[PDB]
Design a protein around this ligand. Sequence first.
Ligand code: A1LWK
Lengths: 327, 295
Amino acid sequence: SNPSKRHRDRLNTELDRLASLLPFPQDVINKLDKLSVLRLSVSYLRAKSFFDVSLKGVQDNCRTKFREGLNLQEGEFLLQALNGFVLVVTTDALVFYASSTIQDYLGFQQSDVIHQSVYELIHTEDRAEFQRQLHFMERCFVCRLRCLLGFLAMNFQGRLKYLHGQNKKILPPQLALFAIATPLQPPSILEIRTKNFIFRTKHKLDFTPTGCDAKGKIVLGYTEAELCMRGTGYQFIHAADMLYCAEYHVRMIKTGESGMIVFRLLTKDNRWTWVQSNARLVYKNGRPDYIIATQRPLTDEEGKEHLRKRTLKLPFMFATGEAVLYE
Amino acid sequence: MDKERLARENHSEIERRRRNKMTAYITELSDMVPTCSAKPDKLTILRMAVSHMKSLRPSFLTDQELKHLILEAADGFLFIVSCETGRVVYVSDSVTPVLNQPQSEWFGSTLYDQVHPDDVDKLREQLSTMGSRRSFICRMRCGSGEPHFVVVHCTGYIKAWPPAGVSLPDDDPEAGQGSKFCLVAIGRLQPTEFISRHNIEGIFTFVDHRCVATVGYQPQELLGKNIVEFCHPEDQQLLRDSFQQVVKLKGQVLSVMFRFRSKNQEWLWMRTSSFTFQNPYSDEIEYIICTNTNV
DNA sequence: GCTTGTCACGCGATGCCCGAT
DNA sequence: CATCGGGCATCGCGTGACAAG
Ligand SMILES: O=C1C(c2[nH]c3ccccc3c2O)=Nc2ccccc21
């Protein structure tokens, strides 16, 4: 042996004792390097010191055993209902805490994120923005964060509150951001099975739907009875498309064929979905009887391209908005 | 320069940074444990930290600490309802600071019983049949006066019932429920123009987004409502006469000026030009198209 | 087949401790 | 009451083995 080896062995013994005490599963602990052992022990101590200040049940007129177990898991239930993750960031941009569900959304392990700089997770072009949120108290903003499953834009809804019990040097507590991060939302139904999801609808002469196939029910989201009890299809059509569809309805009335037309239909979710469609007239004894429209769902990109290259110019062509539908 | 020398220097400085970070973490530990900061070398700091962590002690936080952080971040209260009947299986105590309701008013109750009747249908939509999320907006009753309702944004998910690890005793009220799925959710409180489409009664059925810039409301805050509800009482019958006249004069345009209550509850003078959309086969009125402009 | 990082080790410059002045 | 040399412990440095990616 030798004194250097002896001192290093003492240090490593204490480091292993610290590691075994970390509140993580043993498979996570065994893979930790020594620097992360120290970092996570400091993390745990800072968390406990804060909760000693900040923190501390079913109403007894309400208490059942089952409700008591649910109460014991209330925090996890909240975390699962978040649809995202908890983040708490210090003034020094260190991640005071991140919930485990961050791995579900960005692919980063909780034990790797905690007590590291938050900018390592944030897009460069957005980093500055985040800093201005770290420094009258509520916060609601958007930031793109690294996604190892690559970036995902996330809504941050949070608050600036004093992070007590940090023993900075004796400095007063600094404001930390307590935020919840969730993904973003698009308002258009794009078919995943985009290829050849052709569906057909049957209509009265005024375009009131009377029949729908299974793929139509899947795309639009209406039951067959729901689809036919909402007035003519002009109630389903985007306001930026109604005049074009009306022109093409006239063309079909006059020639029996509508030609290809691209327009947006209102789904049962009150979402818009692009379709390229062709409306044909069926005849009974040489008189128009009903319409058979055959439609292919389009991605938003293809729809925007078609609208950009549109033939006629009609009012409201570039309008965007939301709609509802009754009966 | 020499590739071997630069490799060596980069490596030496990497190891130096590693040593410095180890020292910094040990200093943090000395700040974080009791008798230390009240001076010690590395070994005693590490031993005192081991002792303090043994005192304090698998999740990094307890369930209560996690809940504390979530509610500190963005308020809210948890509720767990069953999907078949809306039956409230669980509600957190946070319902008292959110809705000014005791926990006792949601237990033995139904989510339909707690929302506005105009919303009950919508609720069914959300309760019928990543991780199958649910995200909606409703109106929940509050303490009070008279019936008092507040808009509540709800974020949740569908979960197979009963939940794992929770004991369901034989004599528990939940033993004979037999619900198969449950919604687990959080409820939280809170000079241009735009086009719109209405039915002949005046109900907003299509709203251009520019409404936000024109009158301050989001499109969802107008759709389903009658435009007359936003109009000054001394202009309401004028607006109604315009709506009933535009129907008689299909194709013809009709203009009307009236006071529209912006979302700041402020009166803005608006000029609305309206006309009917005719079904190109039956010539029936599909809807009324309005262009609403600031004046 | 290279890059970055972890871990141990050898090695002195000080540190602490404490009989002996 | 200090000051002073022993010998071991602490502590920072650079380098080499090794491995994940
Ligand atoms: O396919 C349609 C179409 C249409 N399809 C639908 C399917 C379901 C509900 C409503 C509609 C609807 O309104 N309206 C048109 C006008 C001119 C050319 C083609 C079409």
